[PDB]
């Protein structure tokens with residue numbers, strides 16, 4: 001897992017995310033959908049959003065990003081002790097939304113990208129390493145729950 005100092009770095013940059021959860025989520029989704037377009041195909045109501053401005057103007061997308069980042073922020077604040085709130089997330093992502101773990105990696109890449117774009121002075125190498133470890137732990141643990149529910153990563 002992570003050292004206490006690594007968790008502290010994670011929670012330090014997450015409080016910066018929390019000054020604008022909506023805007024970070026929008027930037028993350030726009031990056032994700034651009035970098036990895038197959039990901040958009042999993043979102044039936046965002047597919048008509050053909051341009052960056054349409055994506056930013058969509059309150060449905062903006063709310064979706066806050067919902068995702070809120071759940072992730074709560075997980076990160078448990079500092080690895082997150083079985084109770086990983087279970088429902090794996091349940092829906094595995095059996096309803098059908099999201100491969102590789103897509104969770106794509107979204108992690110977008111998260112790290114946006115964190116650096118917005119907070120370069122507060123997202124240096126040690127903090128980046130910490131966040132990747134924290135997101136890697138999240139993905140590892142949800143991948144195991146995917147298998148417990150059946151059907152692989």
Ligand code: HEM
Nearest residue numbers: 039042043067068071072088089092093097099103104107
């Ligand atoms: C940091 C990783 C992610 C987190 C924490 C997260 C969290 C959530 C949460 C909390 C919800 C609402 C409750 C539920 O349906 O479970 C949700 C919905 C959803 N997520 Fe994720 N998500 C993540 C990644 C992804 C990715 C990468 C995809 C698609 C490539 C995705 C697709 C969806 C879809 C389709 C819904 C339903 C939206 C709706 O119909 O309103 N999620 N997610």
